[PDB]
Design a protein around this ligand. Structure first.
Ligand SMILES: Cc1cn([C@H]2C[C@H](O)[C@@H](CO)O2)c(=O)[nH]c1=O
Ligand SMILES: Cc1cn([C@H]2C[C@H](O)[C@@H](CO)O2)c(=O)[nH]c1=O
Lengths: 314, 306
């Protein structure tokens, strides 16, 4: 059976993920590498009217004190359903074709995705919770809906000094949001690593008590205060005993299950587009490939990707 | 390895699902309605907010767009406990056992599809939710594990209205339009499983909606013929078509059983218990899966069901 290499490029917006990814696709043979792009058209038209604008306008309104935190959360929660739709539908139709993990000879097909389901089911929500525009309950609700992690889930997150990032981003201008999203993804990288080194949130929960003070596949085990777990020490989720309600505890259990088997890689975006491209292309060497389930899975996957790209990525 | 029997009691609210499961020490556990999560843990009085917003919309006090945001947002809270529970329980489910008594029997008050498909679909028919939001929920429906036995209810509308009147939840408003919508959605749901099990292919029969199983117009597929989901030439956009493909996959392997609720509580209880004979049991994955499942159930019940 042919082998497949799925690679999800994710991380804070504005680092050059899109530019880079296409440079990567450009180099490959026409048909042995397909790109599932950002579904902009679904966010601006198909699923709803100008979703990105509504998000930014609401955060701005909230900041100005024109609407309440509750009003903002409803809007943000609702908008996040639209933002994550295409990732979730694509994951559900693609899953059946993924077989077991083959190994780190060239893959018959290579699927480059612009973001992974967790961007919308974990990362953006958590960032919005840090911005005060989303409840911690809604965040964990999204987390509980994260699809089972299939074998060969290779994710690439990005590295970029904040000044370089601000610069690159700056052509609404929300630097607090940029910081938030930056912290969320840092935490995420630490969380996979924490999970892969044996970290048990239930065992280290007691080590959290405090406030706010990154590698994904290298280094020692991070302190739980440096992982996504710290975010959920919110008073809304805590009971009279001081411990988390089980509903939320189970959601953190889901979070750990989902992130422990993922393969995370860091791409240094502080270089030219071609550098990033050559950079990303060299990381593919250590990513895990998987077998497809049917002999005709390759073409089906190709159709899906092209159709997705044509209908939703511009 | 011990065998487990999972039974999800679902259907429109107000038929007596709860009474019947209550009436029906350690070889059968009940995962109840997570009322406390809906009223306190996840958010403040979620059922009230739902009914108030439908009522406000009806009065013309807010727009259809405003209603959908609130409705979409609230549906996240309503389905949270079912989704979290499904996610932690899945790992313990093994393959099917067969067509002797099961070591453990899990009775649930509703299945993830009530909040991930049925309520949203009904609110769409009520004008308080977009068809895009509905399919977004459908796309998140957890993979259907083996032994997914779901019991839906049968009850004449007059008997239902009559009964609904008295079991009004905290914040609920007696809405007959909403009752009809939810009744239709579940009727369609039942037909859809059957359609799917008999070979029905929505892509092949889609044309009959604009031109020995049910007709596609009697399944959930009819609801997604909404103009919002179609391109200028009438075609369903692929994003939505894929969502329908997820819907068929999820519902085809489900085991649906109809319980007649037009009878006394003990009648229903026995009725339900006689239906368990044809439900599919599965093996658990670890030897210590039973107790873990028991803990889960009890803890869920204690923390969220009152
Ligand atoms: C993926 C995703 C992106 N975004 C934002 C980041 C950028 O502003 C823009 C491009 O992805 O959208 C969200 O707000 N939510 C999401 O789930
Ligand atoms: C499960 C669920 C229930 N409900 C409502 C219907 C009834 O008011 C009550 C069910 O006991 O809650 C929703 O509005 N949405 C859902 O997803």
């Amino acid at each position: 059976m042919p082998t497949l290499l799925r690679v999800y490029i994710d991380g804070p917006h504005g680092m050059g993920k899109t530019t880079t990814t296409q440079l990567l696709v450009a180099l490959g043979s026409r048909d042995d590498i397909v790109y599932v792009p950002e579904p902009m058209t679904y966010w601006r038209v198909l699923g709803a009217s100008e979703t990105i604008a509504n998000i930014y306008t609401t955060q701005h309104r909230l900041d100005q004190g024109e609407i309440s935190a509750g009003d903002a959360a409803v809007v943000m929660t609702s908008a996040n359903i639209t933002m994550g739709m295409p990732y979730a539908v694509t994951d559900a139709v693609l899953a059946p074709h993924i077989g077991g993990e083959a190994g780190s000879p060239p893959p018959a097909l290579t699927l480059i995705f612009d973001r992974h389901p967790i961007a919308a089911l974990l990362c953006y929500p958590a960032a919005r919770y840090l911005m005060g525009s989303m409840t911690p309950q809604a965040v964990l609700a999204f987390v509980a809906l994260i699809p089972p992690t299939l074998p060969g889930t290779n994710i690439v997150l990005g590295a970029l000094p904040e000044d370089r990032h601000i610069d690159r981003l700056a052509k609404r201008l929300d630097l607090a949001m940029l910081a938030a999203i930056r912290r969320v993804y840092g935490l995420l990288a630490n969380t996979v690593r924490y999970l892969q080194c044996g970290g048990s949130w239930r065992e280290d929960w007691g080590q959290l008590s405090g406030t706010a003070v990154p590698q994904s596949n290298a280094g020692p085990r991070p302190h739980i205060g440096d992982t996504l777990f710290t975010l959920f020490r919110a008073p809304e989720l805590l009971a009279p005993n001081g411990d988390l309600y089980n509903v939320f505890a189970w959601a953190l259990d889901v979070l750990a299950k989902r992130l422990r088997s993922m393969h995370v890689f860091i791409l240094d975006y502080d270089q030219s587009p071609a550098g990033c491209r050559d950079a990303l292309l060299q990381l593919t060497s250590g990513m895990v490939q998987t077998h497809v389930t049917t002999p005709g899975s390759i073409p089906t996957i190709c159709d899906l990707a092209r159709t997705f790209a044509r209908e939703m990525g511009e």
